[PDB]
């Protein structure tokens, strides 16, 4: 089952597959059988779903055998399985939307501690694999903290989030 | 009958539309009698699909028919 990882605010593109290369009808449905977008011939409609204003597609490439599902401003609340229904198949993919950041926005000093906040989608076990230019490649679960925060810790730390062998990079704000 | 330069008016006689709407809703009730039928407007999309469109006299009329499918319906008017 195809799985994708979002950054809780970026865009996502859900692509199906086809071979007949004629832009045949297609649909997207969640795990609860809810329509989000829609196709009636060659037009593009948006069904009464929570993702009415976020769904997007590449219409010019419909005749080339693609129907990528572009969604803008990804949020954790939209993580659900979606199904491709081009002709007779039920191809299914999943999205995992979460957010990684830090609690201390700007107020920081030398010799202080640092903590990270991770909000994973309901029903996920993300792992935080921090990577730092100074060699502080912290490894841990969803929540990770740093006991030292000095001037040498300058620069945004890239604490990646990995799960199911799929990993996405992130940045950490550090101002002192 | 719809007539009229970006403004025009279409006519709908509720006195004759109500009968057809009632027949259609009554027939729909058979398929799902346990359900309560509620109408509404479109969910959004292309301007040629969400709002009614037609080609008349070399003109591409787009008429907004929202105030005809939003009202809910029941066994009584």
């Amino acid at each position, epitope marked *: 089952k195809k799985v994708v990882l979002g950054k809780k605010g970026d865009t996502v593109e859900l692509t199906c597959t086809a071979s007949q290369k004629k832009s045949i009808q297609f649909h997207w449905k969640n795990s609860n059988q809810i329509k989000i977008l829609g196709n009636q011939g060659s037009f593009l409609t948006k069904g009464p779903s929570k993702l009415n204003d976020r769904a997007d597609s*590449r219409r010019s490439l419909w005749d080339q055998g693609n129907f990528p599902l*572009i969604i*803008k401003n990804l949020k954790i609340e939209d993580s659900d399985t979606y199904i491709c229904e081009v002709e007779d198949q039920k191809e299914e993919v999943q999205l995992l939307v979460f957010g990684l950041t830090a609690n201390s926005d700007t107020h920081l000093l030398q010799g202080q501690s640092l903590t990270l906040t991770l909000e994973s989608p309901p029903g996920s076990s993300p792992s935080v694999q921090c990577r730092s230019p100074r060699g502080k490649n912290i490894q841990g679960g969803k929540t990770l903290s740093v006991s030292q925060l000095e001037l040498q810790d300058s620069g945004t730390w890239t604490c990646t989030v990995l799960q199911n062998q799929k990993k996405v990079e992130f940045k950490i704000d550090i101002v002192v | 009958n719809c007539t009229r*330069i*970006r*403004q025009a008016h279409c006519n709908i006689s509720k006195a004759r539309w109500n009968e057809t709407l009632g027949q259609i809703v009554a027939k729909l009730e058979e398929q799902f009698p346990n359900k309560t039928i509620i109408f509404n407007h479109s969910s*959004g*999309g*292309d*301007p040629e699909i969400v709002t009614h469109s037609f080609n008349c006299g070399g003109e591409f009329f787009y008429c907004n028919t929202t105030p005809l499918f939003n009202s809910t319906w029941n066994n009584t008017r």
Partner: antibody
Amino acid sequence: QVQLKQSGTELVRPGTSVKMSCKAAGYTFTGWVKQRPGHGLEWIGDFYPGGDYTLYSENFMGKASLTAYMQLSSLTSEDSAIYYCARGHFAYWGQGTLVTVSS
Amino acid sequence: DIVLTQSPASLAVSLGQRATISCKASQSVDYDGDSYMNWYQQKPGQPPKLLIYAASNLESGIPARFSGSGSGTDFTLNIHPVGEEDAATYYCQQSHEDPWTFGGGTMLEIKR
């Protein structure tokens, strides 16, 4: 009724980036213009929501990064002017936002 | 780019008379019978208002007094009869191809 509404008056410092917004109503959400005295009207660029397509004139590359929004970078005294939002196909333009580039 | 030249720079017309403004393009704009020229009117404190589009048709809400004629690289915007409210700056713009350029402007003064 096709309607577009822009943000209020803005006063920003040179060298920074200032972002304006234009709202819409009465049609499907899915053009920018600059007017300066002695210059007339200059069509800045065009963009398309629901896919975010970009298009610029020769004198706007790297200067602008565009409910829709616009962001003008490398602000200078020349950018002090009024700006109009206009949904492209320009049927209607925004009322106008006055931007003053000064410290 | 397509360069638009307007004429005259300043125009004064008595109330009720005919006001004509010419716009010339550096390149041919006709595309098999159609001209993709636009003419806009602007007044202080207001955004430009589409007066003429397609070079031969009247925009909705625009009085029929405004009209357009010509072809090739020579077009004319004509106002007849001219009124007090007509005081404004008229601009000619080209939609023949990108980049989408604009005219030099032409102020209309209601001589009284």
